[PDB]
Design a protein around this ligand. Structure first.
Ligand code: CYC
Ligand code: CYC
Ligand code: CYC
Ligand code: CYC
Ligand code: CYC
Ligand code: CYC
Ligand code: CYC
Ligand code: CYC
Ligand code: CYC
Ligand code: CYC
Ligand code: CYC
Ligand code: CYC
Ligand code: CYC
Lengths: 172, 162, 194, 274, 162, 172, 162, 162
């Protein structure tokens, strides 16, 4: 598994070199913003259930076919599987966010996944949408939390978004 | 690749669990510690050239016979491959410093070490003595928590070789 | 148990069979110990439901789980952990003190996840359970090449269906078999009303 | 083991592998004889890069045969997008063109007939294009003139088997996949006794061809839509045949021009005699 | 019992390995974090009495009907067992604060929660609402990293109940 | 598994109580001395091999019967087992030292150990001695290390000793 | 899908064995029982409309507050999704009656029930009370072994929800 | 302990099977071979004294520096423990000769070798050079199949140490 430092190290090694002063300071900056990062990961963990629930309510509000017989979130067994997948993806997105690298998300969760859903007859476009809704709400929480020091978290909100967007793209 | 960050994530994943306060506290340690680590890294990085030549020589001064003909400290190629090897170790030490864990050392030098050294007739004693010397000189390039970090990883290599 | 009937899961299986195989695999790996619904490896159950993994590889994922590490590895001595892995994964007791030593040396050299893989990639696992059978208790039969003491040791490890392998009460974390193995001395505690 | 999700864990490049196993890797725990499950005759498993060399060695030893290795991440991006080609844009040639009308046709015939490989400017059939411009010939002849050309012979025929040639031929000339094993056979026997040229004519003078393209219409894709007297499984063959907009027929592949439609797959649609 | 210290030790043990710089960095996080944690702990400890009575009442104010006869917020024994239960939660929150991890919560309240609540006809909604209220008031007893810690664990309980 | 905090918590809970101001400050002091504790654990880790080696050289210097045929550290297989056990015990002592509690040592290492050795014919008094030698050298290292800030580590040296002494007592 | 027929076949298959007198005796039970089962099924089928409206209302009469604004028994969509859900239960009860086992209930309502209800804030108590009411009225639509069958499956759902 | 006899018996037992013509043919090999083996054994046995002193010295002649002060070929105790160790090897070679397999070598010298040598700072190179020398001299004590046997086992030790 990689994190943002480990990634630097692998690229340096492929040159046969000690880390460039370029790469050093990029990593010094990651340490600089790490308290904000911890709050951002904490924002997701602290509201995981609601993020999934709210995404869910809204997914089925839009796509009332999934909860009809014939639909891929019917009966209870399938809805529980769908709720479970929402949690799994939100979980690996939070891991990537602590790590500063998408690799755990791509390697353990996403990249593939599409071919699973294809065989499962699971409509990937609906799954992509559920991921887009989790993103909206998750970032909502990253931006408006309990008595965190005021500052600018937009860099981290972007990065979190790209992890949500990776997953969506990979699946649709 | 073992870092504080990857370790806590691995432990969460394997229990199917979001990162919680236990895991985020851990991560803060790694981030709080980065300054000392990275100071050690910068000092080891710019002195690399001489740290390597110092340790290479010390292998010959402690094992005089190595530099006689028919031996493995003789001729340009042995002495070249030696400098390179110590340089590999210092390189991974700096990586381990920067990474926040032994991962780079575990994955690129420790995994397989003995099998390789045994097939190629390379004695660990040389490498321990290279590292003992590097440890002596790093005593005056650093101090405080950067020195402790440098030491942690140098010693880690010496234990890997014993 | 006489011969317990081992559950084979076959392809194009609806679910009820998959739910029965999941229950059998959980009863085999964790004994009669309660597992919370929050403690279940929902990802592994979903992969098995999708036919994306074999029953063997579902057992590998369950045995590598942090829950199996907390209950059987962090709470128990290394020799008792090896006695329990042989019970859960292979359905048998250890034959010789040398078999416990080879697993202990592999554990010390290669770590936890490689010890678990060594039981599941064994030719003994493939020959007896294949890819699609849930492991079941076997030490109540004499197999060709099996030590006669394996029956008594399996009975000492197998306290009956009501037995909990996690029992913190004065014997359950102690090596029931290792005391005997090193030498010529004994039999297994029958909890002794049998 | 089958169709995968996700790539890497620590980091890797996952490759998914496929084999054919003996009862040596996988057997049931039954009382007699060692057998693997009949439906896992060829089995596939995704392994990260380090475990990969060790796995292949093991599989080969205990008897299996590796059929494929392909990175997992290639194989996660689905099946092709077909929107551009479900329903195409038809390109025809009028009596008395405005000249660049005729320019449109040539570029399209090229793309379609040659299967999206690049035809470089040294390469183009200039004398033949002269003919279409003057009327002289119609949009059918260039479809026939291009096919008998060396460039067509060379990238699609000379270096691959006849099974492949015919399968490409259906795609190019008719726009649809090959429906039956009989179609393959009926064609191979013709080439064998009347030569290459007679065999080329057989798709361009066919009733199926004539209905859809008539004579002034450039052959266009039509197999992603239901057709007549088409087995049902010929709509899955089309995915195997066309790999996306950026895909092409290409004889420059490292492995060479090869198939794409499994021979086993063709038989599912029926087997007879002759 | 899950703490940063027990987690790193567990991970070392399971690989048959001495604690290394990765694991000691982690531990430093837990120790550096103790001050904020323990401030939260002391504030939650001395306000316990009122935090409990505040949350108990709020369960009845949000679910008015509970306090009517024939219901589960009626009579001395129900209302007594309620105060006790919220008190159990606050108690384990302080323990988790002091311990440096969710262990006390995981072992004494989370393991088994749903089975118990389901057999006894106890709705999680009450308990979430007790905790939401406790979270509102703890906004003005603490601030900065002690508040973040208090929040971390209160929220952890709310997610355990959803 | 327990650490020094977890122990406090278990005793508090058995009273049905929030931690006593007594117990709180005992734990505040453990946090106070934690940098020293980290150096002490680091002293052992950084010299593990030599601690075992030096203990070993000295054990067989004293007890030359163990390395004769008939002896429990003969032939190579048995010596490797004995060297391995020295490492295992030094390991769990270091874990206890990071934890501030002996429980991991008692529960994962010492529990049943004596009866194992007796079953095996391993002379427990010799094993106890090997543990006493590891203690001498380990503490040596805790007390005289590389450029650590100068101060008083005697409290920690005592506590480390009791872990070595627990093991010895448990085994002999 | 669990029926007497599938169960005995499963048990034969798993021992690699032809169906024997044990298994065929079992099947005869399921076939002998079909008449009572299917009478229950027909009565529950034609009364479905009113059984559903009766139980829906009873959920509001037993939990009056549900029908106030801001609550989950308010507005067309909640009240619509409720009727639907009870209708799902009655539907699977009739299926279980016709099928000769709990399979349809196990596969389509029980598997996953709690996870779903917990994510969506649906209290089992409502559903138990819907079913208790349906059980009251089915007392006078059926009698004898058809009533026993209807009861068996209604009670099975109530236990699934406790 | 690995011998031809134990190996075939192990293979029979593990298939729950009486010894058959395959296994008895194997045993005949071991018995037919005993004469050459045991001649090697007797020659190595009576020359032991000098074979050991010859090899011990050769370790110092090939690694001159070992015999200087501060080194591991200096003082009575090192030089004593060396003779002993080579004597152990020759002893197990004779045992392996007499036993009809590598068992005695596998169980008493190979199992654990590297761990021990690594903890005690013993270089395999010495031991290989002791054995290479013993192999040189055994060229003129034996010939034919007794020499081949002696060689087989000496070489087996040298490969165990590389
Ligand atoms: C237990 C693991 C752990 C966490 C969670 C942690 C958080 C943490 N967040 C901090 C700051 C902060 N955190 C934020 C975060 C935000 N600002 C906003 O306006 C956004 C809503 C939000 C975006 C994510 C900001 C702006 C600061 C102050 C600037 C800084 O220190 O970087 C600080 C510095 C002290 C302070 O200023 O309060 C800490 C210690 N420390 C830890 O050890
Ligand atoms: C990524 C980390 C990494 C390490 C650490 C590494 C060690 C390493 N050292 C090697 C060789 C060598 N190593 C040395 C070492 C020395 N010679 C001397 O003068 C001194 C005594 C001593 C230095 C202290 C010598 C002489 C060789 C050549 C051995 C041979 O091929 O005969 C080789 C064999 C391949 C080769 O010939 O380069 C490896 C793999 N390789 C790696 O990839
Ligand atoms: C590596 C982490 C990981 C992921 C991501 C994962 C996905 C995954 N989702 C699955 C099923 C499923 N996934 C869903 C999800 C959905 N249904 C919908 O209609 C929605 C569009 C969507 C929810 C947003 C459903 C309904 C099933 C069950 C399909 C079936 O059995 O019919 C399965 C089959 C095994 C099973 O059912 O447990 C896998 C392996 N498994 C994993 O181990
Ligand atoms: C290590 C090699 C080995 C031996 C020697 C062995 C003995 C052995 N004999 C057994 C049973 C048995 N053994 C007998 C034998 C006899 N009954 C009589 O009346 C006669 C006096 C005698 C035959 C001469 C019987 C009848 C049983 C079954 C007892 C029962 O289940 O009631 C069992 C219980 C497991 C089983 O029934 O398969 C073992 C372990 N098992 C082994 O693995
Ligand atoms: C064969 C069928 C079977 C039975 C009967 C069974 C009993 C059994 N009860 C156990 C624990 C337990 N049993 C209880 C029961 C009670 N506590 C009380 O105070 C009450 C008096 C009583 C409830 C009426 C408790 C509290 C534990 C946990 C003890 C502990 O871990 O501290 C355990 C230890 C394993 C575990 O905790 O899961 C077993 C094996 N196990 C089985 O497999
Ligand atoms: C799911 C239930 C199930 C079926 C149906 C099944 C079929 C099956 N038949 C097999 C072999 C076989 N099947 C036959 C059958 C025949 N040979 C002939 O010439 C005849 C035409 C025919 C008998 C009518 C033979 C000879 C083999 C052995 C092939 C070999 O190993 O060379 C094997 C390979 C494993 C083994 O040999 O045990 C499978 C899996 N396995 C199953 O688990
Ligand atoms: C049937 C008998 C049998 C064979 C032959 C076998 C081969 C085999 N070699 C493997 C790996 C390997 N094999 C090698 C071998 C080499 N690396 C190099 O650079 C050299 C060119 C070459 C040595 C000459 C390496 C390095 C791996 C590990 C690959 C990895 O995990 O990255 C693996 C994957 C499983 C594992 O790592 O244990 C198998 C199955 N397995 C078997 O069971
Ligand atoms: C053997 C008799 C036979 C059948 C049954 C058959 C099915 C079939 N349907 C196809 C396409 C198609 N089928 C549909 C059908 C639908 N789209 C929807 O959204 C609806 C759910 C559904 C209509 C009810 C569509 C839209 C395509 C085109 C897909 C594409 O190219 O993107 C294709 C691909 C070839 C082509 O597009 O002509 C085949 C082979 N082909 C056959 O020869
Ligand atoms: C160590 C951690 C721990 C927790 C959290 C815990 C919860 C818990 N609450 C219980 C009962 C109860 N819990 C309540 C709760 C409430 N009543 C009200 O007025 C409010 C609506 C609500 C408070 C918000 C009630 C009324 C009972 C009595 C239930 C009964 O026996 O009927 C019981 C049953 C045993 C008993 O009757 O005491 C347990 C185990 N037990 C524990 O050991
Ligand atoms: C939980 C952590 C843990 C411990 C502590 C442990 C001890 C332990 N030591 C053992 C053997 C041994 N231990 C020794 C140790 C010694 N011999 C001496 O003469 C000295 C006095 C002493 C070294 C100081 C020896 C020689 C054996 C092998 C005994 C034999 O097989 O004959 C064995 C038998 C299994 C094996 O040989 O691998 C265990 C279980 N095992 C564990 O898993
Ligand atoms: C990577 C994990 C990690 C370690 C190892 C760590 C060590 C560490 N040891 C420290 C102090 C110290 N460490 C010692 C230790 C000793 N004094 C002696 O004379 C004895 C030889 C030795 C006994 C163990 C002393 C006396 C201090 C200064 C007083 C104090 O800060 O408590 C400090 C405070 C800064 C300083 O004064 O240097 C740190 C950060 N911090 C970490 O995050
Ligand atoms: C196949 C078997 C099956 C069952 C049993 C089932 C239950 C079920 N009920 C749901 C929602 C619901 N269920 C209710 C239930 C009620 N509201 C009221 O007025 C009453 C209090 C109560 C009826 C007693 C409500 C209000 C919702 C909407 C929840 C939401 O999305 O906020 C949902 C979420 C998807 C959706 O919004 O439709 C499921 C899956 N789904 C199934 O597929
Ligand atoms: C049963 C088979 C068996 C073998 C093979 C064996 C080897 C062996 N050699 C040892 C020591 C030793 N081995 C030597 C070897 C040498 N010194 C020299 O002058 C030469 C360079 C060299 C001979 C070629 C030395 C010097 C020691 C003492 C190491 C020490 O304790 O510092 C020890 C440590 C215990 C002890 O001090 O005796 C073992 C176990 N032990 C066994 O039980």
């Amino acid at each position: 598994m990689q994190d943002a430092f480990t990634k630097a190290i692998v690229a340096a090694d492929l040159r046969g070199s000690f880390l460039s002063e370029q790469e050093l300071n990029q990593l010094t900056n990651l340490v600089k913003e790490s308290n904000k990062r911890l709050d951002a990961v904490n924002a997701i963990t602290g509201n995981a259930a609601e993020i999934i629930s709210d995404a869910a309510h809204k997914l089925f509000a839009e796509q009332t076919d999934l909860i009809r017989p014939g639909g891929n979130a019917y009966p209870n067994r399938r809805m529980a599987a769908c709720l479970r997948d929402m949690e799994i993806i939100l979980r690996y997105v939070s891991y990537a966010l602590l790590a500063g690298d998408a690799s755990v998300l791509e390697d353990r969760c996403l990249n593939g996944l599409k071919e699973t859903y294809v065989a499962l007859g699971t409509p990937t476009r609906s799954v992509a949408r559920a991921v887009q809704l989790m993103k909206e709400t998750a970032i909502g929480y990253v931006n408006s939390p309990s008595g965190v020091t005021r500052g600018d978290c937009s860099a981290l909100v972007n990065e979190a978004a790209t992890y949500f967007d990776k997953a969506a793209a990979s699946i649709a | 690749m073992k870092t504080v960050i990857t370790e806590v994530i691995a432990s969460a994943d394997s229990q199917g669990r979001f990162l919680n306060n236990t895991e985020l506290q851990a991560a803060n340690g790694r981030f709080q510690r980065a300054t000392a680590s990275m100071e050690a890294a910068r000092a080891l990085t710019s002195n690399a050239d001489s740290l390597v030549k110092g340790a290479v020589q010390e292998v010959y001064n402690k094992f005089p016979y190595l530099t006689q003909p028919g031996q493995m400290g003789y001729g340009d190629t042995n002495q070249a491959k030696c400098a390179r090897d110590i340089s590999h170790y210092l390189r991974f030490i700096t990586y381990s410093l920067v990474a926040g864990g032994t991962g780079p050392l575990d994955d690129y030098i420790v995994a397989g070490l003995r099998e390789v050294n045994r097939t190629f007739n390379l004695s660990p004693s040389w490498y321990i003595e290279a590292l003992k010397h590097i440890k002596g000189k790093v005593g005056s390039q650093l101090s405080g928590q950067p020195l402790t970090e440098a030491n942690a990883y140098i010693d880690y290599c010496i234990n890997a070789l014993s | 148990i006489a011969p317990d009937q081992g559950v084979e899961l076959r392809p194009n299986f609806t679910e009820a069979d998959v739910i029965t195989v999941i229950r059998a695999a959980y009863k085999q790996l964790f004994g009669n110990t309660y597992i919370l619904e929050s403690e279940r490896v929902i990802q592994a159950e979903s992969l098995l439901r999708n036919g994306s993994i074999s029953v063997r590889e579902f057992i590998r994922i369950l045995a590598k789980s942090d829950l199996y590490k907390e209950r059987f590895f962090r709470c128990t001595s290394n020799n008792r952990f090896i006695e329990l892995n042989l019970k859960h994964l292979l359905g048998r007791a250890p034959y010789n003190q040398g078999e416990i030593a080879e697993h202990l040396d592999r554990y010390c050299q290669s770590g936890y996840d490689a010890e678990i893989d060594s039981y599941i990639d064994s030719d003994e696992y493939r020959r007896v359970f294949g890819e699609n059978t849930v492991p079941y208790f076997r030490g109540f039969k004499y197999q060709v090449g099996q030590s006669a003491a394996a029956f008594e040791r399996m009975r000492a490890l197998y306290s009956g269906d009501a037995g909990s392998d996690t029992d913190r009460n004065q014997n359950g974390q102690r090596t029931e078999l290792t005391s005997g193995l090193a030498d010529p001395a004994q039999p297994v505690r029958a909890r002794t009303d049998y | 083991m089958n169709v995968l999700t996700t790539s890497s864990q620590r980091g890797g490049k996952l490759f998914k592998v496929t084999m054919t196993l003996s009862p040596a890797l996988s057997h049931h725990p039954w009382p007699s004889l060692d057998t693997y499950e009949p439906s896992q005759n060829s089995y596939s498993v995704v392994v990260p890069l380090d475990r990969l060399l060790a796995e292949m060695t093991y599989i080969k030893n205990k008897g299996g045969r590796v059929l494929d290795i392909s990175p997992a991440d290639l194989e996660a991006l689905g099946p092709p997008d077909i929107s551009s080609v479900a329903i195409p844009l038809k390109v025809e040639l009028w009596a008395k063109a405005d000249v660049s009308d005729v320019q449109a046709a040539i570029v399209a015939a090229y793309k379609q007939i040659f299967g999206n490989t690049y035809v470089l400017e040294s390469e183009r059939l200039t004398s033949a294009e002269s003919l279409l411009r003057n009327g002289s010939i119609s949009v059918r002849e260039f479809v026939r003139l291009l096919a008998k050309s060396e460039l067509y012979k060379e990238r699609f025929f000379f270096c691959t088997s006849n099974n492949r040639f015919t399968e490409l031929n259906f795609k190019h000339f008719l726009g649809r996949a090959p429906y039956n094993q009989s179609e393959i056979a009926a064609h191979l026997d013709r080439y064998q006794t009347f030569g290459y040229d007679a065999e080329i004519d057989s798709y361009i003078d066919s009733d199926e061809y004539i209905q859809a393209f008539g004579e002034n219409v450039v052959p266009y894709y039509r197999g992603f839509k239901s057709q007549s007297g088409q087995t049902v499984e010929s709509f899955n063959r089309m995915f195997k045949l066309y790999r996306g907009d950026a895909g092409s027929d290409t004889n420059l592949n490292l492995q060479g021009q090869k198939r794409r439609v499994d021979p086993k797959n063709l038989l599912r649609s029926g087997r007879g005699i002759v």
